[PDB]
Amino acid sequence: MSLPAHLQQTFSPEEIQFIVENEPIKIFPRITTRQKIRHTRWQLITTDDKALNNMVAMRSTEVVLWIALLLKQQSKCSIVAPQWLTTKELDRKIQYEKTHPDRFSELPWNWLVLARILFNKAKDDFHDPIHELRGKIQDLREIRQIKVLKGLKYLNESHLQLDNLSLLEINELRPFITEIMDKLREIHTASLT
């Protein structure tokens, strides 16, 4: 069959990765492609090409994440840390979480995956002590998982409202939640005449 079973009703972490890389990101080029008014060109299709042919050294700009990672694999690019990825921001989110146990924080839908990617291949850029950032991310993960369990306590046929749950967590919990809801609905419907 054209699709493996494990892919039948969800996305593996790799697909989540890919969809994340589809996003853009601040970067500081170490090259100046922009040709002076006084040559190989990108000419992409799925993303912008205007910026790429206008790279200027040490000039912030946006590029799709995967291109940024490709360059970062080379010494020719530097990945700018997203603002939300900052000790101040993480601490604020943690405090909000503790303040509102019922609700989740408004982290970027792709915060976990993005943080992991940057940590793996962008340790240099991170201004703050990388270890502290990893620890705070882990703490956020723990808190969100606890709140996930608390919400699960109230699993019901009618509906669910995850709100600010991150995409990675959503993919993680998709099978269990969906199946449980399906069985509960089946039971209740069977009860219906």
Partner 1 sequence: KFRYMPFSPAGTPFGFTDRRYLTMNEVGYVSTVKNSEQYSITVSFFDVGRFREYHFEDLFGYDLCFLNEKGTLFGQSKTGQIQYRPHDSIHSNWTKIIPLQAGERITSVAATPVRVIVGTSLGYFRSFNQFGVPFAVEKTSPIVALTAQNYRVFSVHYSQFHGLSYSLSELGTSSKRYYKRECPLPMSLPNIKDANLDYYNFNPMGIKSLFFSSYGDPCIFGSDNTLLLLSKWRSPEESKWLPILDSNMEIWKMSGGKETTDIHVWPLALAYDTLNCILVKGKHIWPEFPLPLPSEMEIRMPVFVKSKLLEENKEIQIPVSMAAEEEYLRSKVLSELLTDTLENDGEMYGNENEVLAALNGAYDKALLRLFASACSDQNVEKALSLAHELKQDRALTAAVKISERAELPSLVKKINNIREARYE
Partner 2 sequence: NGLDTNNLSHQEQEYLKEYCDLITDLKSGDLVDIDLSGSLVPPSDVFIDVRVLKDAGEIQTEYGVFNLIKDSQFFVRQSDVERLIQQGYLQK
Partner 3 sequence: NDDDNTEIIKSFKNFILEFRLDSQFIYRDQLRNNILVKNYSLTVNMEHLIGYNEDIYKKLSDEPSDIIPLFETAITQVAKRISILSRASLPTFQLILNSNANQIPLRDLDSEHVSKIVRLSGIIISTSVLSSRATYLSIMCRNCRHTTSITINNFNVSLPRSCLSNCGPDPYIIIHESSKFIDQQFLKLQ
Least CB distance from residue 95 to partner 2, whole Å? Answer: 35
Counting contacts by CB under 8 A, is residue 144 touching partner 3?
A: no
* Sign of the CA dihedral with 117 first, then 120, 121, and 124 last: positive
Determine the number of helices (DSSP H) and then strands (DSSP E) in the chain.
Answer: 6, 3
Residues 23-52 close enough to bind partner 1 by CB under 8 A: 28, 30-32, 34, 36-38
Comparing CB distances to partner 3, the nearer of 72 and 144 is 144
d(CA 190, CA 193): 7
Q: Does 173 bind partner 3 (CB under 8 A)?
A: no
Interface positions, 18-57, toward partner 2 (CB under 8 A): 18
| Angle (nearest 5°) at CA 88 between 81 and 143 | 100
C-alpha distances out from residue 68 to 59, 61, 82, 176, Å:
14, 11, 13, 35
* Cα 122 to Cα 129: distance, rounded to the nearest angstrom: 13
121 binds, options partner 3, partner 1, partner 2, none, Cβ within 5 to 8 A by partner type: none
Q: From the CB of 2, what's the least distance to partner 2, in Å? A: 8
Using CB under 8 A, list all residues that contact partner 3. 98, 101, 116, 119-120, 131, 134-135, 138, 142-143, 146-147, 150
